[PDB]
């Protein structure tokens with residue numbers, strides 16, 4: 149159809165423009181890394197309103213060689229993030245990350261979205277290993293679990309990245325119902341690839357076989373369990389396009405939740421907030437007000453669109469209650485907003501994280517440049533960098549993603 153073809157043509161245009169800005173911005177990062185290597189860069193002391201958005205420098209030239217090394221590792225971190233964004237902008241699929249504190253109902257929500265009791269769901273801490281659900285066409289139609297062993301690479305990210313269906317040395321095969329035995333084994337597995345078919349449902353009601361976009365769901369291990377587990381959730385975030393953040397109604401957004409949201413918000417201006425266990429709350433209106441106020445503070449653009457992105461969903465499994473015909477307008481409304489965001493609003497759902505991150509990073513570089521401008525060799529460098537990064541930020545702000 150016309151409006152579908154129009155979204156595709158707009159999506160391709162925006163993807164071209166963002167890729168171009170990513171490459172230019174990486175060059176500025178490379179230029180800043182070389183300059184700092186020969187003449188360490190002055191870092192100003194920032195109050196809270198003027199704190200940098202992406203370049204996390206705990207230290208300043210007034211109060212803090214060791215500052216130079218923190219800067220270098222900051223640029224490396226940003227470079228890795230820009231590469232991850234560039235991979236995502238070029239990837240046709242949409243990866244959805246379902247995360248939150250332990251025991252908020254993450255796996256129950258994934259079962260809800262898949263309309264079956266597939267992922268282990270339990271009163272006590274359960275999911276210790278990233279569980280990615282994909283349609284089985286990627287695995288030649290075969291429904292099974294590929295369990296990626298930690299011991300195939302030095303780091304979990306590297307184990308994940310060397311997995312190939314074509315190379316059996318990178319995974320163990322297991323049946324779908326071995327999953328309750330697999331998801332606790334974070335001392336053994338980096339990640340579970342869970343391949344399923346959904347052949348009895350039409351594309352209109354099938355999330356994984358929707359017929360226009362390849363989607364995978366990643367069920368996260370919980371926040372606030374272990375330092376290593378939290379660090380892995382923090383870094384998996386930048387390799388995924390969309391976050392669904394799951395909130396326990398009794399606790400609202402805890403400090404561990406806010407630390408994740410605040411880190412993800414460097415690129416994810418928009419994200420879903422799904423509040424579970426609201427059915428248990430006695431003072432429902434006071435609870436709802438608390439949650440909404442925290443979202444306003446942590447994710448103001450999500451708050452403006454709260455009707456599309458904030459949902460209260462009590463569906464859980466503790467005959468299959470996830471494919472039951474019983475009416476559930478709360479879940480139905482979440483499923484509809486998710487499909488609309490992912491399938492129809494691709495420029496926003498896929499590409500807004502790239503624009504948001506570039507905008508904030510260019511801002512930071514603009515601030516550093518202004519701070520480092522009147523050796524005189526260094527003066528000319530920061531004048532060129534100021535003028536170039538200013539122009540690039542204006543170009544990124546030109547890119548209009550709200551065209552669907």
Ligand SMILES: Nc1nc2c(ncn2[C@@H]2O[C@H](COP(=O)(O)OP(=O)(O)O)[C@@H](O)[C@H]2O)c(=O)[nH]1
Pocket residue numbers: 249250251252253254255256257268269270271273274275370424425426427428461462463464465466
């Ligand atoms: N009453 C109620 N129980 C829920 C809800 N969501 C999840 N549960 C239950 O809470 C427990 C934890 O769910 P689980 O999905 O394992 O949470 P996860 O650890 O965050 O993945 C399970 O017993 C679920 O059945 C909800 O909205 N209401």
Ligand code: BEF
Pocket residue numbers: 249250251252254255272273274275276368369370371
């Ligand atoms: F019990 Be975990 F938060 F899936």
Ligand SMILES: [K+]
Pocket residue numbers: 250251269270271272273274275
């Ligand atoms: K649990």
Ligand SMILES: [Mg+2]
Pocket residue numbers: 254255256268269274275367368
């Ligand atoms: Mg779980």
